[PDB]
Each structure stands twice: as structure tokens, then as C-alpha cells.
Write a structure and sequence with these properties.
Chain B: Forms heterodimers with envelope protein E in the endoplasmic reticulum and Golgi. Interacts with Serine protease/Helicase NS3. Interacts with NS1. Chain B: It is found in: Host cytoplasm, Host perinuclear region; Host endoplasmic reticulum membrane; Host nucleus; Secreted. The structure is a homodimer. By secondary structure, chain A is mainly beta. Chain A has 2 domains: 215 residues, no CATH class; 137 residues, no CATH class. At the A-B interface, strand 1, strand 2, strand 8, strand 10 and strand 11 of A face helix 1, strand 1, strand 2, strand 10 and strand 11 of B. Strand 10 of chain A pairs antiparallel with strand 10 of chain B, so a sheet runs across the interface. The structure holds a molecule of 5 linked components (NAG-NAG-BMA-MAN-MAN), oxtoxynol-10, a molecule of 2 linked components (NAG-NAG) (3 copies) and 2-acetamido-2-deoxy-beta-D-glucopyranose.
Chain lengths: 352, 342
């Protein structure tokens, strides 16, 4: 197989340092000090201006065979777990089609644009022992999700690069809903806590209490956050978890905010989503026992583009839970417009 | 944003080599480094106010608190360094009381009383257990880090008296992280490392001291569905309630050599010894040292149903084996065994 060549790997005899820890120097801006050593270094990659990591199959040829096998067994298509996976399919389809074509296989890979959240599917690709394979796109009768594969691939090893690293995907030996743990980084230091990977950045901090402070989701996925990489996962009420478990929300008490419950009806279908606790520009939020109950997350702008100024909440805490998306700024479920006149507002239709 | 301004102002910024990711990367985030194996000399405790602390003590002394037990060596060394300053203050406020701090050899044990912010004439810190000043009348875990220093004083840590009552460890000095095939539970004296080989399991631990506080759940990984019998480092000895704190074939080392000072746990053979699986072997017992009091070597060891490599302790007085690992020869040569039972 000529699409892959390795370099140095882990098992190489390193006399200088621990090969499976991160080794370097960093400035601790709190204490204002420079420290070198070995350990675990967690970086923010969700908010990077370009992609450091890129998926590629370990063997394109092998992957083409996995697909034609799946095609024979009734698997009409596939749904990606993440934007990065989607970009791999988008980037490798012409290569796959060539493999299939030159081997006289009546099958072509079709990958459609994915705008919303990356949803789950029941089927799985497996290793070896209509004439199209559709990746993502809208939900159709021609290729329903229930016949599509999802979360069938995981990272085997990484590829060196100068301004970007390759991640090579292999076929999973098992069936899980769990996110690939190889790309997960979780850490807590100086009472600041991070649950992260290549698309989620979830930050909780101890102010007067431990609570969620900020979250950035480059996409909204449907895999499961592993317990191995989860902080504070004892005595959990899934109702209190701000980011829903079914949306790769960490089953962690860090994933909470007093006054708030599970945002099952947040704007998850908006693409990139950023959660934090501040006021939407030009709006206000006041406590009122005479306020509406939890409902779909509402955007602070109308379909026309008019601004809803006055907002209320029954029993939440301030500052309000705020979403920021491409289409504007939204408020958490427990926060409702104060005026009952619906001006044809924009609300989430997700319910997850 | 607000919380994004805070992160840049309070996070770690630098570069590191990741052989796992096969990359060299710079950036901002959170860095957990190894400090137990060198840095206990560079970070140092200071009380926020000696003066305020002297008042805190004389109050507690009046309320029947005869003395104190430190949570950690770092705390112990603070007392040792600040006693002359406190005693001077006490003298100057006409208070018939002096602080006495004794050497601490064993594990740092717990105590029920607490100092608060708002008939001997001595306040005893640590030392052996006495009837003159019993543990049950001493305070413990009354302090926490208020804040850190800066630039030149970046390695200074200023302590305040706890506003609340817990058994939990000071969380401000805790670093817990997992990335690639590595998961770390650490602070200024514990380094607890688990690795993903075929499965996630404990691989190595270094304890510069053995303390008796409780590892916070907020800084605990994989703390769901815990069987405490399976936790290698005992919960009562600041062991993390984590499934990372496990090793297939082994149960809680309640009778390990915790009273020896520095302890290093890992899974390798003691030099000159061997370990074999045998159903005709002894059941779990106190951890045994591979050398006798005389200085003779035990070579042959057995275990009933554990996994190899064996659980190994390393202390100043030598190398020991896990509770489930017993000498194969039944002739007792007067062995050196742990007497802790925790
Ligand atoms: C880290 O965590 C700390 C504490 O957990 C936070 O500190 C608090 O921040 C809030 C937000 O500003 C403060 O609340 C404000 O208090 C002002 C004064 O308090 C009134 O009420 C008290 C009763 O306790 C009286 O004693 C006092 O005399 C005042 O009458 C108010 O003026 C503020 O009101 C504003 O917002 C309300 C919201 O409805 C409006 O109705 C008002 O018109 C006005 O616009 C607000 O209530 C609180 O005082 C702070 N406490 C402390 C101890 O500092 C930090 O904010 C937090 N930091 C981060 C980054 O998260
Ligand atoms: O150290 C200072 C870092 O300065 C910050 C600049 O950005 C750092 C991000 O990393 C990119 C570095 O760019 C150069 C690539 O470095 C990798 C080592 O280069 C050796 C490659 O030689 C050929 C490989 O075969
Ligand atoms: C792999 O596991 C998943 C989850 O355990 C299975 O998903 C279920 O599949 C059935 C129909 O196939 C659906 O009705 C359920 O709703 C699914 N549960 C979910 C999505 O949580 C899946 O069937 C398994 N597939 C294989 C090939 O093992
Ligand atoms: C009051 O406290 C002092 C200091 O702790 C006690 O003096 C020591 O007591 C121990 C107890 O066995 C002796 O071993 C030491 O030799 C004593 N001196 C020193 C310098 O440590 C004293 O006994 C206490 N008096 C009481 C309880 O009545
Ligand atoms: C990771 O686990 C594997 C077993 O799953 C270890 O492999 C064994 O290594 C020992 C000595 O290194 C050999 O005697 C065995 O034959 C190996 N077994 C197999 C199945 O290969 C491996 O050593 C572990 N890695 C580390 C770093 O401890
Ligand atoms: C400290 O708190 C614990 C928590 O239950 C309690 O049992 C104990 O009595 C308290 N001690 C003091 C001195 O307040």
C-alpha cells in the first residue's frame, strides 16, 4: 500500500523524555512564570483560524472495498460524525470513485453539503473477510438515515505535516456511540476546566461556584462523550446538563448552570454555535414570576430583522444564557420575550 | 467576550512536542507538568497574615485545641518557617502561648478540629501521637491557598484559613488532565498516572508524602460507577475516586507501606525477585519488603489471582510488593511488613 509511510512512532527509544507525554515550555500567565517539562498540553483548536488536523483514510483502496461491501449489504449511504469527517469525504470522493471505476464496480460516491447538525445513524461499516453511495445531505426517501452508516471510523495514527497534521482513519472493530477518544483533551488546572476535542471547546470555571462559563461548538454532533475523558461525572442528573448528552455533551457537573436545565431545544441546527453567559446586544433580561415557561430557543431578531428588546425569565440566574450563531444571537430556553405578541419570531425546531 | 478575555489572561501559553500526534504545536491552553519529582523545593507556602493567624490560633487554643496536624509536607515546612514570627507576635500581645512544631516522619494523618476566621501553654504541630496533645483535639485541613505570587514571587503561595469545613484537598493546586494515551491526576505532592495500553489502567504513581485529605470529584476523571474495593490508592489516602485508579487483578492497597514517607508505585519486578501465579498461594496481607530486618533477600514470590507485572512499591528502606503478592516460602524470616491498615 503506497498511500502511507510512517516516520518515528512511539516505541522508538527516547532517552531524552517520555514519548507519550507532551514535552515543551509554557508561560503561566496567571503566575507569570516560565515552566518546562513533560505532561499534558491542551490547546484550543475549535477557534483556530485554519485547520491543523485533517482526516485521511489509512488505505483509500481498502476504504473503497469497505464501501462496496456495505453497498452489497443494503447500506445506501453515510452520515458524518463531524465537519472534519465531512471535509474528508468531500476531499477524497473523486479518489474513491476512480478506484471503483477502474475496478469495474458500478458504484459512485456522492457527498452532499451538510448545513445542520450532524445526526446519528444505525448502520456501521465493517472490515472485509441504485448505484450510488450518498454521504450526508438532506434527509431523503431515496436514501433514508436508517439505512446509513455513522461513527464507523476512528483514528489509527497521525501523519506529520508542517502547518497541519494528518489523522488516519481505520474501520472500528466495534459498535459504539462514543466520540473518538484519540482526539479528546480534558484538563483542569487553577480551577478552570476544559472538555475539548477538534470541534467542541467546553469551559467551566470556579467563580463562587463551579459552573459552565463558555462553550464553542464548531458543529453540533450526535456522538457520546466518553466517561474516561470526563471530569466530575458522579451523581449526575442528565436534566441539569446544559449541553445535551445526546449531542456529545459531557456527562459532567461542569456542564451545568444554576437556574438552567438541559437545553434540549437550543439552536443546534444553526451550524457553528457559541454558548456563554452575557446579554444580547440591545436586549435586557429581568426576573418575573409572571413569565412564560421554557420553550424553543428564540433569536433576538425577527424574520423581518426587528429586535426583541425586553426579555424575562421565571427562575433562572443572571447573566442570561446566550447563543451566538451565524444568523444572530439567541437566548436560553428559560428566557422568553416579555411581550406575548408574536412578531413572527425565529425559534429552534430541534428538540434533542 | 468576558470568559474569553479571562482565559487568555489566565491560561498557559507555549510550545510542546507530541510524538503521539506526530507534531510540534504552539498555542494557548492548559499545561499539566511533572512537579512531584523535582519541584516540591521551588513552590513554598506562606500565610497571608502571620498576625491574623496568631489571633486565629489563640482563639482555638482557648476553645480546647491543643495543637495541629499538617495536611502535607509543604504545609509542615511553612509552620516550621513561621513559628518564630508567630511566637514573637504572641509574646508582643501578652499571650502566654508558644507554637512548637515537631518532626513528622510518618504519613500526614487527619484530625477532627478546625481553626476558624471569626491546660498546657503550647500549640503543637505534628510530631508523634501523645496523650498530652491527642489527635482528637487537634485541627487539620484548616488552610487553603488564597492566591499565588507574580513574576519573581510566582512560586510563592499565600494561605488563608478555610471558611468552610471539608476533608477535601486544596483544589487550587490540583492539575488533572487526559490526552492521547495518558491521564494524569496530580498536585504538589501526588502524581498519579494512568495509560491506555490495551485498556485504561494505572501505570505509575509518585507520592512525595502520604496525606489523608480527600480527592475532589471536581478534579476527578472517570468517576462514574465506582467500586471502592477496586481503587488501588485508598480513598482515605487522597486517592482519586477514578476508574483510572485501578489495575486488573488488584484491589485496594489498604495495607501498603504508606508510613514510609515517599512512596512510588508501578508495575515491575523488585530487583532479584520473581513472581508466579499459584492457587496454592497466600491470600492478601500486609505489603512485604523484599529485604529482612537483618538484610536478607526474599527471592521467590507468589500471587493467587493477580496480573503481571506485579504491583511494586519503592521507598527509602527498599522495594516492596502489593498486598496480593506473598513470599512463596512459608518459613518466616521475620519479614518487614506494613502496619498501616487504612
Ligand atoms: C463572579 O461571582 C461573583 C459572585 O458570585 C459575581 O459578583 C456579583 O456580580 C453581580 C452582577 O453584577 C452583582 O449583582 C449586582 O448587584 C448590584 C448591587 O446589589 C444590590 O443588591 C444588594 C443585595 O444583595 C444590596 O445590598 C446593594 O446595596 C444593591 O442594592 C446591583 O446594582 C446589580 O443590579 C443590576 O442588575 C439587575 C438585574 O436585574 C438590575 O435590576 C439593576 O437595575 C442593575 O442593572 C446586580 O444585582 C453582585 O453584587 C456581585 N456580588 C459580589 C459579591 O461581587 C461576579 O459577577 C462573577 N464574575 C463573573 C465574571 O462571572
Ligand atoms: O519555536 C518558536 C515557534 O514560533 C512560532 C511560529 O509558529 C509555530 C507553529 O509551528 C510551525 C513551525 O513552522 C516550521 C515547521 O516546524 C517543524 C520543524 O521543521 C523541520 C522540517 O524539516 C523537514 C521535515 O522533513
Ligand atoms: C450499533 O449500536 C447502536 C446503538 O446501540 C444501534 O442503534 C439502534 O438501532 C436501532 C435499529 O437498528 C434503532 O431503532 C435504535 O434507535 C438505535 N439506537 C440508537 C441510535 O441509540 C445499532 O443498531 C447498532 N448497529 C450495529 C450494526 O451493531
Ligand atoms: C506541654 O507541652 C510541652 C510541649 O509539647 C510538653 O513538653 C514535652 O512533652 C513531651 C511528652 O512526652 C516530652 O517527651 C518532651 O520531652 C517535652 N519537652 C519538649 C521540649 O518537647 C509538656 O509535657 C506539656 N505539659 C503538659 C501536657 O502538662
Ligand atoms: C501493553 O500491553 C501489552 C499486552 O497487551 C504488553 O505486551 C507484553 O509485553 C511483555 C513484556 O513487554 C511480553 O512479555 C508479552 O509477551 C507482551 N504481550 C503481548 C500480547 O504482546 C506491553 O508490554 C504493554 N506495554 C507497556 C509499555 O507496558
Ligand atoms: C466538619 O464537617 C463534618 C461534615 O459532616 C462534620 O461531621 C464535623 O462534625 C465538622 N467538624 C467541625 C469541627 O465543625
Amino acid at each position: 500500500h503506497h498511500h502511507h509511510s510512517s516516520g518515528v512512532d512511539l516505541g522508538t527509544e527516547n532517552l531524552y523524555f517520555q514519548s507519550n507525554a507532551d514535552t515543551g515550555c509554557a508561560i503561566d500567565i496567571s503566575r507569570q512564570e516560565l515552566r518546562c517539562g513533560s505532561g499534558v498540553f491542551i490547546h484550543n483548536d475549535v477557534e483556530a483560524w485554519m485547520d491543523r488536523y485533517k482526516y485521511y483514510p489509512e488505505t483509500p483502496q481498502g476504504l473503497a472495498k469497505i464501501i462496496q461491501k456495505a453497498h452489497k449489504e443494503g447500506v445506501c449511504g453515510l452520515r458524518s460524525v463531524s465537519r472534519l469527517e465531512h471535509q474528508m469525504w468531500e476531499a477524497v470522493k473523486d479518489e474513491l470513485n476512480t478506484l471503483l471505476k477502474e475496478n469495474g464496480v458500478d458504484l459512485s460516491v456522492v457527498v452532499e453539503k451538510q448545513e445542520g447538525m450532524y445526526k446519528s445513524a444505525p448502520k456501521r461499516l465493517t472490515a472485509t473477510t441504485n448505484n450510488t453511495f450518498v454521504v450526508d445531505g438532506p434527509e431523503t426517501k431515496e436514501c433514508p438515515t436508517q439505512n446509513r452508516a455513522w461513527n464507523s471510523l476512528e483514528v489509527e495514527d497521525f501523519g506529520f505535516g508542517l502547518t497541519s497534521t494528518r489523522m488516519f482513519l481505520k474501520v472500528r472493530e466495534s459498535n459504539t456511540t462514543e466520540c473518538d477518544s484519540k482526539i479528546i483533551g480534558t484538563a483542569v488546572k487553577n480551577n478552570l476546566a476544559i472538555h475539548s476535542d477538534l470541534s467542541y471547546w467546553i469551559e467551566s470555571r470556579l467563580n463562587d461556584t463551579w459552573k459552565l462559563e463558555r462553550a464553542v461548538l464548531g458543529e453540533v454532533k450526535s456522538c457520546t462523550w466518553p466517561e474516561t475523558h470526563t471530569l466530575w461525572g458522579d451523581g449526575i442528573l442528565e436534566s441539569d446538563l446544559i449541553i445535551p448528552v445526546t449531542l456529545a455533551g459531557p456527562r459532567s457537573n461542569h456542564n451545568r448552570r444554576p437556574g438552567y436545565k438541559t437545553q434540549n431545544q437550543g439552536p443546534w441546527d444553526e451550524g457553528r454555535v457559541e454558548i456563554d453567559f452575557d446579554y444580547c446586544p440591545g436586549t435586557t433580561v429581568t426576573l418575573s414570576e409572571s413569565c412564560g415557561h421554557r420553550g424553543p430557543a428564540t433569536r433576538t431578531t425577527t424574520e423581518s430583522g426587528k429586535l426583541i428588546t425586553d426579555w424575562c425569565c421565571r427562575s433562572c440566574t443572571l447573566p442570561p444564557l446566550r447563543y451566538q450563531t451565524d444568523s444572530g444571537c439567541w437566548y436560553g430556553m428559560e428566557i422568553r420575550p416579555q411581550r406575548h405578541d408574536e412578531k413572527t419570531l425565529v425559534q429552534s425546531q430541534v428538540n434533542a
